[PDB]
Amino acid sequence: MNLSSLKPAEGAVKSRKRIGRGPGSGLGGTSTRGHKGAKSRSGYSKKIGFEGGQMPIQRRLPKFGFKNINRVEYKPINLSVLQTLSEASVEDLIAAGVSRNSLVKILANGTVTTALTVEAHAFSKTAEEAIVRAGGSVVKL
Amino acid sequence: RSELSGSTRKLIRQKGSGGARRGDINSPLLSGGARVFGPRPRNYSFKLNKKLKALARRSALSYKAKNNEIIVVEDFNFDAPKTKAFKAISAALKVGEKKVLYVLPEVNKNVYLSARNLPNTNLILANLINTYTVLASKNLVLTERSVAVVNELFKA
């Protein structure tokens, strides 16, 4: 193709819907709005959380809990991806190839099965036991 | 309606006059009234992914190569601007009938001045190649340095 025979992919562009333009289109007259009432008028809008005057669910239910400000949340990294990164080293904690100046916690879902010394901010007890069983070490710093 | 110059006074009293009820003179129903849902100033730019743009560029170049409109020529310079010399170059390359696009490695002011007045000729730098410009011309002419630049800068 050139500029003279351009063609979009099949089904990529669709024509817009145009209402209030006659009977044959199926969208004229009342123009998809029904007959009367509030919803038929220009400028009608739905009040969010309004149910006709019945007490809404967001007022019927109670508030609960609180959110801690200084919440230390770790990014989880598992043994399976540790072994995947190991199989193209034996000294992890690079982890940029991920995170971006974050705190990392090593978790035990797969298996290490290698001899690695892993440096991370946190480990689980199962993860520590797994890496030491496979013959590794932890640097919790 | 809010930008017309008439006043907001009720033209006729609400009841009793025997005609249609009327508000102010800026109504779209009245001759000289408001334009409803007319044009507003707009910005038509949108985003395409960089990799999508690169793919489109390479597709245009591949299409030119497959359809055999790419001619590689030697680099040339002009001591003084001269339209006749560029016309002769186009005639010798057999590109002077339809639209042609020459791709140059650098500015080459004398060459640009020479090609300025020719009607079916376009010039472009190698590093500024885009899909529209590549596709808009029947013939593509490259120099050796332009080929090197395009290969280095638009690969994969």
Partner: protein, 64 residues
């Protein structure tokens, strides 16, 4: 303009792992000697928003 979250909804609802809405049962604040122990424990437990009330709770939470 960007959509604004409803403050009451953001104080009353929470998202679960598989995109469900977590909520607290509401009949247990101040008349509890009369009620039944099993009733009170079932109101203590954390419930989920009904499917018909979903997308309304989502509109309140800005479809999040």
């Amino acid at each position: 303009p960007k959509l604004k979250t409803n403050s009451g909804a953001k104080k009353r609802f929470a998202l679960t792992g598989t995109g469900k809405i977590k909520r607290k049962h509401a009949f247990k604040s101040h008349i509890l000697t009369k009620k039944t122990k099993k009733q009170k424990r079932n109101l203590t437990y954390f419930s989920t928003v009904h499917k018909v009330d979903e997308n309304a709770v989502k509109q309140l939470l800005c479809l999040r």
